[PDB]
Write an enzyme that holds these catalytic residues in place. Structure first.
Site, PDB file in Angstrom:
ATOM      1  N   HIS A  96      35.861  40.288  47.686  1.00 43.32           N
ATOM      2  CA  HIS A  96      37.295  40.271  47.958  1.00 43.32           C
ATOM      3  C   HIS A  96      37.787  41.584  48.543  1.00 43.32           C
ATOM      4  CE1 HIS A  96      37.711  41.872  43.695  1.00 43.32           C
ATOM      5  NE2 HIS A  96      38.593  42.632  44.319  1.00 43.32           N
ATOM      6  N   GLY A 123      41.939  48.851  41.794  1.00 40.10           N
ATOM      7  CA  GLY A 123      40.943  49.666  42.459  1.00 40.10           C
ATOM      8  C   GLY A 123      39.632  49.843  41.708  1.00 40.10           C
ATOM      9  N   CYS A 149      37.514  47.513  40.903  1.00 42.30           N
ATOM     10  CA  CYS A 149      36.522  46.502  41.239  1.00 42.30           C
ATOM     11  C   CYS A 149      35.330  47.131  41.946  1.00 42.30           C
ATOM     12  CB  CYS A 149      37.144  45.411  42.108  1.00 42.30           C
ATOM     13  SG  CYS A 149      38.195  44.303  41.140  1.00 42.30           S
TER      14      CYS A 149
HETATM   15  C1  LIG Z   1      39.689  45.218  41.544  1.00 42.40           C
HETATM   16  N1  LIG Z   1      40.071  46.206  42.266  1.00 42.40           N
HETATM   17  C2  LIG Z   1      40.695  44.349  40.690  1.00 42.40           C
HETATM   18  C3  LIG Z   1      40.514  44.685  39.176  1.00 42.40           C
HETATM   19  C4  LIG Z   1      41.729  44.031  38.325  1.00 42.40           C
HETATM   20  C5  LIG Z   1      42.950  44.799  38.691  1.00 42.40           C
HETATM   21  C6  LIG Z   1      43.858  44.989  37.303  1.00 42.40           C
HETATM   22  N2  LIG Z   1      42.960  44.828  36.186  1.00 42.40           N
HETATM   23  C7  LIG Z   1      41.739  44.286  36.751  1.00 42.40           C
HETATM   24  O1  LIG Z   1      40.732  44.005  36.134  1.00 42.40           O
HETATM   25  N3  LIG Z   1      40.564  42.861  40.960  1.00 42.40           N
HETATM   26  C8  LIG Z   1      41.650  41.971  41.320  1.00 42.40           C
HETATM   27  O2  LIG Z   1      42.803  42.371  41.408  1.00 42.40           O
HETATM   28  C9  LIG Z   1      41.363  40.360  41.586  1.00 42.40           C
HETATM   29  C10 LIG Z   1      41.239  39.927  43.099  1.00 42.40           C
HETATM   30  C11 LIG Z   1      40.821  38.367  43.201  1.00 42.40           C
HETATM   31  C12 LIG Z   1      40.484  37.942  44.702  1.00 42.40           C
HETATM   32  C13 LIG Z   1      39.611  38.061  42.162  1.00 42.40           C
HETATM   33  N4  LIG Z   1      42.390  39.491  40.890  1.00 42.40           N
HETATM   34  C14 LIG Z   1      42.814  39.690  39.502  1.00 42.40           C
HETATM   35  O3  LIG Z   1      42.314  40.601  38.839  1.00 42.40           O
HETATM   36  C15 LIG Z   1      43.869  38.704  38.795  1.00 42.40           C
HETATM   37  C16 LIG Z   1      44.909  39.154  37.900  1.00 42.40           C
HETATM   38  C17 LIG Z   1      45.804  38.210  37.276  1.00 42.40           C
HETATM   39  C18 LIG Z   1      45.702  36.781  37.507  1.00 42.40           C
HETATM   40  C19 LIG Z   1      46.691  35.735  36.813  1.00 42.40           C
HETATM   41  C20 LIG Z   1      47.098  35.844  35.440  1.00 42.40           C
HETATM   42  C21 LIG Z   1      47.992  34.884  34.844  1.00 42.40           C
HETATM   43  C22 LIG Z   1      48.498  33.763  35.593  1.00 42.40           C
HETATM   44  O4  LIG Z   1      49.377  32.814  34.992  1.00 42.40           O
HETATM   45  C23 LIG Z   1      49.842  33.043  33.636  1.00 42.40           C
HETATM   46  C24 LIG Z   1      48.084  33.649  36.967  1.00 42.40           C
HETATM   47  C25 LIG Z   1      47.199  34.603  37.564  1.00 42.40           C
HETATM   48  C26 LIG Z   1      44.657  36.356  38.394  1.00 42.40           C
HETATM   49  C27 LIG Z   1      43.765  37.297  39.011  1.00 42.40           C
END
Ligand SMILES: *C(=N)[C@H](C[C@@H]1CCNC1=O)NC(=O)[C@H](CC(C)C)NC(=O)c1ccc(-c2ccc(OC)cc2)cc1
Ligand SMILES: *C(=N)[C@H](C[C@@H]1CCNC1=O)NC(=O)[C@H](CC(C)C)NC(=O)c1ccc(-c2ccc(OC)cc2)cc1
Lengths: 305, 305
Positions: free
Chosen positions: A41, A143, A145
């Site tokens: 991603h 950040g 990830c």
């Molecule tokens: C990497 N840089 C980050 C690490 C995360 C940021 C904050 N804490 C972490 O672990 N990875 C990401 O941001 C992901 C990108 C996708 C393409 C996998 N997405 C997520 O980490 C994410 C956060 C929250 C939700 C979510 C929660 C609750 C609801 O409904 C109640 C809907 C969605 C999904 C994905």
């Protein structure tokens, strides 16, 4: 001595972390030989992560669209490919700091160290267990990830985890180094259920053995039990059932401390249905399940690397 | 995210650990520039540690009586001197892996990472606080002496601790890198009292702020208090009294979370005299005091090195 949650020394992994930038998204990558590994991603915008078509997104990317930086020095990207949920970038320079390494897929209940990173720079190290429901209870900001989980056997680094996302409950999910998620999770910003977690029973018993070795003995009771009898109460309290394989793994600890595993189960039994009465065990008011029997032996025998 | 006890990455300290042998006693040393630092009781036999006269013991030792080994390569010792409870060995080679470093004496309540070592080889890393009574609650087996505690500021390693001994209660005692013990302890195998320990109040408040940031808010109460009123209950529960200096250190966290420090004291007040009712905070059933306000900000802001 005493007993702490201990991470592996992280120097060998520190030498492998780089910064990977695609567009305006930056995250961490792992540089081993002439390949950099990172979450796919990295190619997504904020809008893309709601519903990404990763094949379609990657087709618009060329090698020169990937900025890979180690320190103030950059690698030239000469090839890219997507394997499951990880992206592999072929670079023209093999990492002179590559340790002896292996990629492993761990089992639920096993533990590992996490080197949490930002912008390719190491920030801290902590110890984690892969929960039975295949999440981890980490500490990860935006950040982070591409930060990786690992174990060390003498001189060999076994990479087992790379961080991809946080769940609605605040727990964390990620992949092995071939890009296959642990658990039923997908790399999309959509609500996802981890399902009921359960307590790693064999790890709790290992920790009670660690307690006895370190002078904490008050919980030692006068009862015994059977495997089926103990498992009846394990199920009631959301504990993994105990198998003969688990008893066998506990055997070295049983034979050093002179406490039969089924006797330790009876003590745990009474703890589960009577609580701790406000006392502590090894400085905790809860039953700890993130130490494996192997971790206990390592810490109580002083294994070095 | 979430919140874990996090150690600094240890790679810079790993490159400084060596094995020091005098007679049949082996322990760990710290190689910085052309000097190796290690506990002076490396010169003692088992019988010597009951009542050592270190000046008399050291006079019988010459440079060539000290075996210093890094990996399978050895250093030649060309000078030795004893400073307080540490021994300094001058070697003919400056450590090519010496980081930018400093020697600091920390204050009670401050935290640091420990790289636990055996035979000069790193074994694991964990986070520690210097207790108000100047002990640490470590994890240390025979041969661990000379393992060091440290903090990292970007590229600079501040060494603050080196391990020397375990107390009757099982807690641990050691020196700064000039060989001056923290606390009233001496390097002799004789029974020694650490005295009453107390809970680091400013650290407990920092952790309650960390809890609020990470969604744990149930303990937030409807009362307030004053500094003198809170300190009346702090004394009763063996908590350090809170000063304006401590409120000021908590200020950044107060201003980010919108909770006045005196309001957070009132919540802690009720927790102290009413308990946790079987609930948890950040996954603990106890009040944690081994995170400083600085540690909380680092973890919640993603400081890198
Ligand atoms: C990497 N840089 C980050 C690490 C995360 C940021 C904050 N804490 C972490 O672990 N990875 C990401 O941001 C992901 C990108 C996708 C393409 C996998 N997405 C997520 O980490 C994410 C956060 C929250 C939700 C979510 C929660 C609750 C609801 O409904 C109640 C809907 C969605 C999904 C994905
Ligand atoms: C370094 N290699 C070790 C590290 C310690 C070994 C086990 N856990 C540890 O932290 N350092 C030493 O062995 C010390 C050598 C002297 C010269 C400082 N000594 C001790 O660590 C020590 C242990 C126990 C006692 C003790 C306890 C209780 C009583 O009466 C009830 C008397 C003595 C003193 C010193």
């Amino acid at each position: 001595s005493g007993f702490r949650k201990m991470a592996f020394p992280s120097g060998k992994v520190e030498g492998c972390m780089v910064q990977v930038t695609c567009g305006t998204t930056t995250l961490n990558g792992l540089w081993l030989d002439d390949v950099v590994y990172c979450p796919r991603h990295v190619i997504c915008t904020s809008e893309d992560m709601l519903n990404p078509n990763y094949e379609d997104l990657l087709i618009r990317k060329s090698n020169h669209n990937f900025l890979v930086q180690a320190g103030n020095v950059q690698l030239r990207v000469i090839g890219h490919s997507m394997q499951n949920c990880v992206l592999k970038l072929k670079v023209d320079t093999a990492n002179p700091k590559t340790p002896k390494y292996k990629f492993v897929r761990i089992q639920p209940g096993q533990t590992f160290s996490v080197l949490a990173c930002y912008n390719g720079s190491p920030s801290g190290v902590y110890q984690c267990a892969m929960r039975p429901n295949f999440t981890i209870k980490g500490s990860f900001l935006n950040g982070s990830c591409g930060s990786v989980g690992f174990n060390i056997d003498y001189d060999c680094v076994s990479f087992c985890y790379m961080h991809h996302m946080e769940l609605p409950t605040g727990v964390h999910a990620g992949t092995d180094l071939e890009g296959n998620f642990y658990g039923p999770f997908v790399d999309r910003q959509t609500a996802q259920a981890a399902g009921t977690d359960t307590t790693i029973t064999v790890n709790v018993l290992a920790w009670l053995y660690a307690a006895v070795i370190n002078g904490d003995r008050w919980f030692l009771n006068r009862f015994t039990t059977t495997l089926n009898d103990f498992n009846l109460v394990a199920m009631k309290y959301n504990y993994e059932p105990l198998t003969q394989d688990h008893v066998d793994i506990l055997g070295p600890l049983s034979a050093q401390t002179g406490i039969a595993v089924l006797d330790m189960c009876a003590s745990l039994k009474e703890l589960l249905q009577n609580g701790m009465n406000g006392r502590t065990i090894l400085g905790s008011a809860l039953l700890e399940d993130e130490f494996t029997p192997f971790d206990v032996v390592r810490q109580c025998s002083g294994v070095t690397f």
